[PDB]
Design a protein around this ligand. Structure first.
Ligand SMILES: [Cl-]
Ligand SMILES: [Mg+2]
Ligand SMILES: [Mg+2]
Ligand SMILES: [Mg+2]
Ligand SMILES: [Mg+2]
Lengths: 241, 204, 4, 196, 250, 222, 244, 231, 243, 195, 4
């Protein structure tokens, strides 16, 4: 059964190497979450540093692609860094050729089209990663666009990725049923980050220290990650409420 | 050694009432030496007529090239190419050789089979389109033809009148150019009949 | 050629 | 063209005229010859407008891709990328570029890249056709660790003379101030600088 | 390194079957139902918007795509394969036609170019066939309105009306009863919505249905005025509101 | 050739003459030098007529594909960047001098491109042989915060300066107005101040004047 | 490496057969029957459409019969997509010859070059052969009316009457039974339809399931006309012979 | 077993069987010995014949005036690698007017052998080499294996029953290392070493091949009646 | 099954068995360690003395990249050399364009992307080495460890080879007992001890110790080998601790 | 190279070609045949740049001979001329063009008609009753305009040709050492040995 | 051709 070794159709019309690439996604055992404010888009991911010899500052699955675009990866770090470098190169070239900053949804489509090629061409394996792109687009506003090994991509009101994704998804679904809107009705990004962490705590049922989380924030004209002290400040706010 | 004026020759096209006319001289020379008095410069691909002045090897090459292209067009489209479309094909083909061009002055003429509108167009050697209501001129006696056409021409001429105007325009222009003349051909083109007349002109 |  | 970059106590200031000429005809009298390659790395363009624009565009691309991977590049790094393009394509380029940038470690720095594609790090640099007339003046008047107001006057008086004597230079005097504070754009009109 | 797969991954079996084309058709069968109906004065193409998650914004994912101002396409099967085919289909309409003749290609010829791309994935080295069947609706001056189906093999057929994917067998039987040669465009949209309700299980509204037409020229959608010959695109995507209006008189 | 671009408060207007020439001869008495890159991005071209047409259509084609790919209305800076990179590659061998103008989500824009790949920014620009005649008028009458009707008047006046004073320019005035939140309106032959006076005589020949050697019916059908 | 997944499309069996050519011929044997009959004053091309649906557009359709130039046509049996690749190549080869010699391409030269392309796919390249058999019907001023067939092997032969696709065994027996050399076009039209009518897998042969074409000298004086029959024209010729 | 089809495949225990099979070709090859003092480096090679009518396969190749190797395994592979060394030695001379360091020679062979063990289609080299040389840091002896592993040694041996000579040199290490300014005595120690790898056969005049390089000695090979002295 | 026969093939688990097999080749190799210190990094490696015939101090395993980076690796030694050769090309092209010597994180990803590339195709074999490397840049000292998969992280201490678990346990103690930091000269002595302790898992053959270090104060930010008095001082410290 | 004439009469084509091969101030040869038989009923005479002439003629001859074997059929004179023109048309935009001018005299067996084609090095083809290349035309064209009739016999054609050679020997500056004359008709190609 |  060599139809399970390369990206060709099985008798039942399936690509097993795409399906197995999806399972490689959860190999890191890390859950990510993305939500949109009014002015901002917040992405949070679990940060697990099991080895005591590791430099914890260098352990990151969030990447600054361009000044405006941020990207979080669910999957092994080698494929994650492979995807990050390409996305950075693609965003830089786009600006040079077309004279304006690459939009979040366009980069997502470009990376998805690249992912699609690996599912149709035999010599290239799919990357075992799910790419969540976040920005505050100058046209579309707060934006979340997610790519998978199948070459699928779509925009999200909010999204979650990882082993306990379904629990986080239903937690967020229930909130947007209640709030009756497409976003977190909040002025400051500080409080949208607090919302993201609060709803991850409720879904996963675990408490977080400052070193257990990794936070990225997209505002107009810049995306930036929060330091341990930035997160700690944020955790203190949640606790005192 | 000016490619456009070695062989010599002229083409002129005019529009009338529900008709077009395209005419050309018959001379092919090598500078001073007259060689052939049968070299026609007007070809047709279905109901679309193309006149080509300039270097005679390129006149022949482009005719063979557009026959090739219009034949494949007809097989794939399952219909004859229209003048407006053919004009664009000529332009594309000429500009493809932008930095090694065909030394030619092509002129498209024909009636759109769908709309019944008379259409004429001229091109430069790099393929720039010159669209006109009235007339297009090309060749070694283009100056002379411009002078004749601009004075003689009037709009909405009947086929029989348009024949006299284009014929007198070509003949009198050709007689003031050394490298043009040696006989002439005039095509009168109506919606669904085409008359081809050989003119009597001075043979010097 | 033509110039404008 | 008349362009210069001067290092002072708080950072560096870029100065330029606004005149672009084809022959003796002024094609653009309000040209912006001071261009951003990074947030606090700017350059002064002299020579072929087409060539200097093409170079500046590529460098901005390289430093954007550098920033994505390795964070903020040094002013020296920016000058090295400019040099690489200018030197390797010396046979097809007419471009004299002054690179000026503000680090927090290195403070204000000025690199000049003449036609050859050579790099020269200087306390201040002058370039373009107008520069010939102000070598004498600039040498006699430049001091190290000037204040902002002193450096603005030094550039204004210098380019004022360059503009007065060079037919190729004229219009407004644009300046760009690079300090820890940020990026400040300054403009000075004929009615001011002419009667200095 | 380098693509060492320079040999066909699609070959003839002893029975004469091309396995990878058959399996690609099986993938299309699993795909969500899409259909096309040709009227006298237009064409309609419609499909269900199967939402991967209720958090996903199904407006961002476009199953019905503009190829030229007068040609549209819809699919059943693998969306990613469809997306890159739309990109290649839009580009080939320019490079191999518009940049030569200064006008957009007629429906049949663009369909032929798309078919050629899908046929090459069937025979070229180190590639699997595309796992999609396309329905391409379009208008051109000399052929009028037309509707084409394109299969993973690269084979295409013209249709008065048809369906592809999940419930295509039942949908085709439904269209056979309703279709006549005197259908006006509004009557064809009505039938398209009736047919699609049979295959759709969950919600049936303008937010879960994607529907576009090839009809009259739309001067309002052109973006400029002053050229009389340029009268605007015949392809128009119906809005979420426009669909809901026709679902009340259903 | 005389082409100008004028910025006003809510948009940009471009105008051009309608004369095409080979040497001192007038090939086209009414030629269209105003080209559509996209619905709301218009281009005016001087220099090699074939080159301006070809470069306009190529970037226009690539801009349409880019617009479809990105699901966004095209930007003037995109058309500008793609043009100037292409023109620079050919080191001035493509003799296209363009005034690029349009409206996009970012706002209203006015640029000029030279054959060597240099670009300029301005509120008023002029290119072609009649540019000096046009720029004289623009420098005399242009002010900040022009209205639509003032910008059309100024632009058409600058073209007229070229028509009358420059031998390379003549015939009619084409205008295109690109206003924000509105469809661009292309005003083909906006002014026609060079109408040919009635001829003194009809040169319609008596039928049979031309001597004929042979007649034959040509077969155009299959 | 990639050696593991190579089918080796261009190798010999121990018996000295080309596997992929044999299996491609097995593929074509399930395709709709196509018949060519050559008369003294023209050629007939008939072809049965593969199990038609009642909602298929019949008039603006082309499955079986294609035009290569004004003097040559082909009837297809196999993968339509594969055939269209080879047809576009053939169409170009014909125009290349016309451009070079200012003369229409002789039928055999076009057939040889198309057959030589197929041969290539069986000997080198490691790709699958084209799952297509052609019937070439054409005229040139050297040999006059000519019928040929080519198959995935790249082998071509000349015929007076021939079938390709499904039930060729049954079809070739019926043609071999009723054909004769002094036959006219109108007689060949009748034979072609009578053959398909008996060898069809369908219940009854109807106009909507047929493509039909003739290459006559039925134009005005010493020139050849190609006639790709319209649906209504096939309906008329089917009643005239008395099949419906 | 299932993981020896090509060089690009690792075994479940992390082995490259194609490289190990190439290593096996060396063991089948005829014995050759390398040893050095501080002044001189010596190669001693037992040459092999097809039969009594055949010549004895030449084991020693000169690379430069100051460097050369002996081979054990596929002789054509030795010709390829020796030709590559000649070019690298020659490049060092022409461009830098510099004799190539014996250590760099090793590094260059290592990197050339490695590329053949990581790429599809190619195969490992099926030969082991003993490179001797005298450069700016005195005498040197290298052992090359087609895995890519190059090792600098005082003495060693490769080929069939090489373990006999390698044990002898390990015992004699302290003696032969201090044979300075005496070529003949260093060769004798090499000839006595290779004698420990002999079974039934003994060293004859057209059987034995000796090479030497040193301080005031260019790399020179001795065959035929020139080696009769040392039997 | 048969998912383990080809590189770049996902198993139903979502694993690349050929990379996991390359790790077994690394686990089989000799012990190599890295220790990050106050103002630099220290590298040390176990060299098994197979025979008396090996020339001491003349089979160097630690390699320098540019002038400021040190690399050491366990597993297939030739594969390590091939990776360093690439690193030297990457560091040269970076300096050529950007003038500044390549930063360690930048360098780390250059190796990372290259090793990862050898898990994308069945026409190449994964690297049979874990590489411990680092040095001093403008932002200070950096220690990295890179694995056959292309995975790499920053480390306080790193260990790979047969005695990795023994070395890791000894590294973890240093990190706990010196939170403020370890000095360059201290790290050299500790490196010696940890190699001697990790030699217990490879104790059939006796070995030869090799140490290198980059330090902003001790080596002026350049990579240098520890030789002579400083080496013998570190060996004596290690010899005292095992007894 | 220099003088090559062609006269199409009722039933044949006659090609006259000068015999002189001059380099510098030396006539190296006075018996040179500036013609190749392309097929049994097609003859091509050639004049132009040294080396290029023969190299081009033989290259064409090889290609027509290859076609004749492949199809077991002789290409029409019209077909051969069209092939030759396209080769020159390609040549002129090459790195180093063939500077060769040719006359193609052939008898079309299907039409039963003689045909003369004049093709210059640019690829300028014309069918003519009479043709010439180089300076020869400046004398022969006006002479043939006068004396030529379309219904002439081969013998009349040869007398008309003698009149051309006499005029050229009288008024041409250079000694071209007479001509080799060849007749192309229904029976193929034969050489007139006494001229 | 513009200069600066
Ligand atoms: Cl893409
Ligand atoms: Mg694959
Ligand atoms: Mg005359
Ligand atoms: Mg005359
Ligand atoms: Mg001035």
């Amino acid at each position: 059964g060599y139809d399970r070794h390369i990206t060709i159709f099985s008798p039942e019309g399936r690509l097993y190497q795409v399906e197995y690439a999806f399972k490689a996604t959860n190999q890191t055992n890390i859950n990510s979450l993305a939500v949109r404010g009014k002015d901002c888009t917040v992405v949070i991911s679990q940060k697990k540093v099991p080895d005591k010899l590791l430099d914890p500052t260098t352990v990151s699955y969030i990447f600054c692609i361009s000044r405006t675009i941020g990207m979080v990866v669910n999957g092994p770090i080698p494929d994650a860094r492979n995807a990050a470098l390409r996305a950075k190169a693609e965003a830089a070239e786009f600006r040079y050729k077309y004279g304006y900053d690459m939009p979040c949804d366009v980069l997502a489509k470009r990376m998805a089209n690249l992912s699609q090629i690996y599912t149709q061409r035999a010599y290239m394996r799919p990357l075992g990663v799910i790419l969540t792109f976040v920005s505050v687009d100058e046209e579309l506003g707060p934006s979340i666009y997610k790519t998978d090994p199948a070459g699928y991509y779509v925009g999200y009101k909010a999204t979650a990725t990882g082993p306990k994704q379904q629990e986080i998804t239903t937690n967020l679904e229930n909130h947007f049923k209640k709030s009756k809107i497409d976003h977190i009705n909040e002025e400051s990004w500080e409080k949208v980050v607090e919302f993201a962490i609060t709803h991850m705590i409720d879904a996963l049922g675990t408490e977080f220290s400052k070193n257990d989380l990794e936070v990225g924030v997209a505002t107009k004209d810049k995306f930036f990650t929060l330091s341990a002290e930035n997160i700690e400040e944020r955790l203190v706010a949640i606790a005192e409420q | 050694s000016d490619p456009s004026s070695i062989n010599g020759g002229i083409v002129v096209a005019m529009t009338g009432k529900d008709c077009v006319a395209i005419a050309c001289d018959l001379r092919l020379g090598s500078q001073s030496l007259g060689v052939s008095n049968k070299f026609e410069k007007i070809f047709h691909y279905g109901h679309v007529f193309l006149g080509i002045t300039g270097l005679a090897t390129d006149v022949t090459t482009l005719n063979e090239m557009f026959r090739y292209k219009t034949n494949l067009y007809k097989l794939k489209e399952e219909r004859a190419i229209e003048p407006e479309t053919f004009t664009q094909l000529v332009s594309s083909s000429l500009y493809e050789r932008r930095f090694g061009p065909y030394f030619v002055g092509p002129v498209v003429a024909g009636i759109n089979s769908k709309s019944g509108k008379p259409f004429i167009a001229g091109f430069d050697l790099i393929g720039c389109i010159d669209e006109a209501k009235d007339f297009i001129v090309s060749g070694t006696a283009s100056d002379q033809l411009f002078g004749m056409c601009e004075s003689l021409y009037e709009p909405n001429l009947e086929p029989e009148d348009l024949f006299e105007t284009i014929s007198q325009a070509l003949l009198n222009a050709a007689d003031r150019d050394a490298l043009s003349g040696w006989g002439a051909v005039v095509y009168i083109i109506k919606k669904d009949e085409v008359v081809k007349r050989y003119l009597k002109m001075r043979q010097d | 050629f033509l110039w404008x | 063209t008349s362009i210069m970059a001067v290092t002072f106590k708080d950072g560096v200031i870029l100065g330029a005229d606004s005149r672009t000429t084809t022959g003796a005809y002024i094609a653009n009298r309000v040209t912006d010859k001071l261009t951003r390659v990074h947030d606090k790395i700017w350059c002064c363009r002299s020579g072929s407008a087409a060539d200097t624009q093409a170079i500046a565009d590529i460098v901005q691309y390289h430093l954007e891709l550098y920033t994505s991977q390795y964070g903020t590049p040094s002013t020296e790094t920016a000058a090295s990328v400019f040099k690489e393009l200018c030197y390797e394509n010396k046979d097809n380029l007419t471009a004299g570029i002054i690179v000026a940038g503000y680090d927090d470690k290195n403070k204000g720095e000025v690199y000049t890249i003449p036609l050859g594609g050579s790099v020269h790090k200087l306390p201040y640099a002058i370039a373009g056709s107008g520069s010939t007339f102000i070598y004498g003046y600039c040498d006699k008047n430049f001091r190290e660790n000037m204040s902002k107001e002193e450096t603005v006057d030094f550039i204004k008086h210098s380019l004022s003379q360059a503009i007065k004597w060079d037919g190729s230079s004229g219009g407004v005097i644009r300046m760009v101030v690079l300090t820890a504070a940020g990026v400040e754009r300054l403009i000075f009109y004929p009615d001011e600088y002419e009667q200095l | 390194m380098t693509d060492r797969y320079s040999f066909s991954l699609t070959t003839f079996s002893p029975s004469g079957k091309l396995g990878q084309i058959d399996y690609a058709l099986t993938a299309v069968k699993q795909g969500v139902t899409s259909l096309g109906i040709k009227a006298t004065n237009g064409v309609v193409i419609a499909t269900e918007k199967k939402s991967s998650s209720p958090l996903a914004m199904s407006e961002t994912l476009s199953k019905v795509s503009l190829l030229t101002p007068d040609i549209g396409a819809v699919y059943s099967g693998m969306g990613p394969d469809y997306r890159v085919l739309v990109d290649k289909s839009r580009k080939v309409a320019h490079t191999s036609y518009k940049r030569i003749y200064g006008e957009y290609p007629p429906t049949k010829l663009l369909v032929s170019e798309v078919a050629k791309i899908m046929q090459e994935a069937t025979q070229s080295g180190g590639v699997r066939p595309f796992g999609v069947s396309l329905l391409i609706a379009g208008h051109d001056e000399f052929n009028g309105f037309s509707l084409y189906q394109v299969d993973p093999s690269g084979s295409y057929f013209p249709w008065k009306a048809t369906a592809i994917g999940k419930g295509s067998v039942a949908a085709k039987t439904f269209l056979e009863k309703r279709w006549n040669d005197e259908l006006e465009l509004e009557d064809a949209i009505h039938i398209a919505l009736l047919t699609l309700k049979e295959s759709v299980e969950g919600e049936f509204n303008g937010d879960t249905i994607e529907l576009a037409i090839i009809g009259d020229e739309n001067p309002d959608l052109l973006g400029y005025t002053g050229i009389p010959t340029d009268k605007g695109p015949r392809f128009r995507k119906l809005t979420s509101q426009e669909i809901n209006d026709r679902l009340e008189a259903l | 050739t005389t082409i100008v671009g004028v910025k006003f408060n809510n948009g940009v207007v471009i105008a051009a003459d309608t004369r095409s020439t080979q040497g001192p001869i007038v090939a086209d008495k009414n030629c269209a030098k105003l080209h559509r890159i996209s619905p709301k991005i218009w281009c005016a071209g001087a220099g090699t007529a074939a080159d301006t047409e070809a470069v306009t259509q190529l970037i226009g084609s690539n801009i349409e594909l880019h617009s479809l790919y990105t699901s966004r209305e095209p930007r003037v800076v995109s058309a500008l960047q793609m043009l100037k990179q292409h023109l620079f590659k050919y080191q001035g061998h493509i003799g296209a001098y363009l005034i690029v103008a349009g409206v996009d989500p970012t706002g209203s824009h006015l640029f000029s491109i030279h054959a060597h790949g240099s670009t300029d920014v301005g509120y008023y620009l002029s290119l072609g042989s009649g540019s000096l005649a046009a720029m004289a008028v623009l420098e005399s009458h242009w002010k900040q915060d022009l209205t639509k009707e003032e910008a059309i008047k100024l632009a058409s006046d600058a073209i007229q300066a070229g028509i009358w004073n420059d031998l390379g320019s003549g015939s009619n005035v084409d205008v295109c107005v690109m206003e924000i939140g509105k469809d661009a309106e292309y005003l083909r032959n906006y002014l026609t101040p060079n109408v040919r006076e009635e001829k003194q005589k009809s040169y319609k020949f008596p039928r049979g004047t031309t001597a004929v050697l042979k007649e034959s019916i040509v077969n155009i059908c299959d | 490496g990639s050696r593991r997944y190579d089918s080796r499309t261009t190798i010999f069996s121990p018996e000295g057969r080309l596997y992929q050519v044999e299996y491609a011929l097995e593929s074509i044997s399930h395709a709709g029957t196509a018949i060519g009959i050559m008369a003294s004053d023209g050629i007939v091309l008939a072809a049965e459409r593969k199990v038609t649906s009642t909602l298929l557009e019949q008039d603006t359709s082309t499955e079986k019969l294609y035009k290569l130039n004004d003097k040559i046509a082909v009837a297809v049996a196999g993968l339509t997509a594969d055939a269209e690749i080879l047809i576009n190549t053939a169409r170009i080869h014909a125009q290349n010859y016309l451009k070079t010699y200012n003369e229409d391409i002789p039928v055999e030269i076009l057939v040889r070059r198309l057959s030589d392309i197929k041969q290539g796919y069986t000997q080198h390249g490691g790709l699958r052969p084209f799952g297509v058999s052609f019937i070439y019907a054409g005229y040139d001023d050297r040999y006059g009316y000519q019928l040929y067939t080519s198959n995935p092997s790249g082998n071509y032969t000349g015929w007076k009457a021939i079938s390709v696709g499904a039930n060729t065994s049954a079809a070739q027996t019926l043609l071999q039974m009723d054909y004769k050399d002094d036959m006219k076009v109108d007689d060949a039209i009748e034979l072609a339809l009578k053959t398909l009518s008996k060898t069809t897998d369908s219940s009854a042969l109807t106009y909507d399931r047929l493509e039909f074409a003739t290459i006559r000298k039925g134009a005005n004086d010493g020139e050849v006309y190609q006639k790709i029959f319209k649906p209504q024209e096939i309906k008329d010729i089917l009643v005239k012979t008395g099949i419906t | 077993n299932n993981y020896d089809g090509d060089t690009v495949t690792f075994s479940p225990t992390g082995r490259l069987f194609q490289v190990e099979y190439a290593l096996e070709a060396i063991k089948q090859g005829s014995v050759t010995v390398g040893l050095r003092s501080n002044t001189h480096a010596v190669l001693v090679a037992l040459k092999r014949n097809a039969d009594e009518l055949s010549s004895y396969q030449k084991k020693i190749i000169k690379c430069d005036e100051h460097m050369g190797l002996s081979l054990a395994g596929l002789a054509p592979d030795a010709r390829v690698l020796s030709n590559y060394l000649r070019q690298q030695c020659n490049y060092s001379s022409l461009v830098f007017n510099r004799k190539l360091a014996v250590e760099r020679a090793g590094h260059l062979l290592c990197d050339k052998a490695q590329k053949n063990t990581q790429s599809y289609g190619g195969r490992p080299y099926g030969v082991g080499l003993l490179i001797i040389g005298y450069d700016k840091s005195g005498a040197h002896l290298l052992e090359f294996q087609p895995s890519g592993n190059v090792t600098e040694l005082y003495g060693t041996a490769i080929g069939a029953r090489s373990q006999g000579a390698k044990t002898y040199l390990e015992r004699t290490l302290d003696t032969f290392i201090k044979i300075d300014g005496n070529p003949d005595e260093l060769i004798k120690a090499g000839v006595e070493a290779i004698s420990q790898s002999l079974r039934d056969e003994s060293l004859t005049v057209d059987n034995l091949s000796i090479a030497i390089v040193g301080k005031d000695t260019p790399f020179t090979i001795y065959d035929g009646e020139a080696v009769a002295k040392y039997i | 099954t048969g998912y383990d026969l080809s590189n770049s093939v996902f198993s139903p688990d979502g694993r690349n068995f050929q990379v996991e097999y390359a790790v077994k080749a690394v686990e089989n190799g000799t012990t190599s360690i890295g220790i990050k210190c106050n103002d630099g990094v220290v590298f040390a490696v176990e060299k098994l003395i197979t025979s008396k015939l090996l020339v001491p101090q003349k089979n160097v395993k630690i390699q320098v990249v540019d002038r400021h980076i040190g690399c050491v690796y366990s597993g297939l030694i030739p594969d390590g050399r091939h990776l360093v050769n690439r690193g030297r090309e990457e560091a040269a092209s970076f300096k050529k364009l950007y003038k500044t010597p390549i930063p360690i994180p930048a360098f780390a990803d250059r190796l990372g992307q290259y090793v990862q590339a050898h898990t994308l195709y069945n026409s190449v074999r994964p690297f049979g080495v874990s590489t411990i490397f680092g040095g001093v840049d403008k932002n200070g000292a950096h220690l990295y460890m890179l694995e056959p998969s292309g995975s790499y992280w920053g480390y306080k201490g790193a260990a790979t080879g047969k005695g990795r678990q023994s070395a890791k346990a000894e590294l973890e103690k240093l990190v706990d007992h010196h939170p403020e930091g370890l000095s360059a000269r201290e790290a050299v002595k500790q490196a010696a001890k940890i190699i001697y302790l990790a030699h217990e898992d490879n104790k059939e053959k006796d070995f030869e110790l090799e140490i290198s270090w980059c330090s902003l104060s001790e080596t002026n930010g350049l990579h240098k080998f520890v030789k002579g008095d400083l080496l013998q001082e570190a060996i004596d410290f290690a010899q005292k601790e095992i007894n | 190279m220099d003088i090559i004439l062609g006269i199409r009469v009722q039933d044949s084509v006659i090609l006259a070609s000068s015999k002189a091969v001059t380099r510098g101030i030396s006539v190296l040869k006075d018996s040179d045949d500036k013609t190749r038989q392309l097929s049994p009923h097609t003859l091509m005479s050639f004049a132009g740049e040294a080396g290029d002439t023969v190299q081009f003629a033989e290259y064409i001859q090889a290609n027509i001979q290859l076609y004749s074997i492949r199809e077991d059929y002789e290409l029409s004179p019209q077909a051969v001329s069209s092939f030759v023109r396209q080769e020159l048309a390609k040549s002129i935009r090459s790195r180093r063009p063939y500077q060769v001018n040719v006359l193609i005299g052939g008898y079309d067996k299907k039409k039963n008609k003689p045909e003369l084609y004049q093709i210059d090095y640019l690829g300028t083809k014309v069918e003519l009753p009479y043709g010439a290349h180089g300076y020869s035309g400046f004398y022969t064209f006006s002479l043939l305009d006068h004396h030529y009739r379309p219904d002439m016999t081969t013998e009349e054609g040869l007398d008309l040709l003698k009149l051309c050679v006499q005029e050229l020997e009288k008024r041409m500056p250079m000694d071209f050492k007479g001509v080799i004359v060849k007749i192309v008709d229904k029976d193929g190609i034969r050489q007139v040995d006494d001229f």
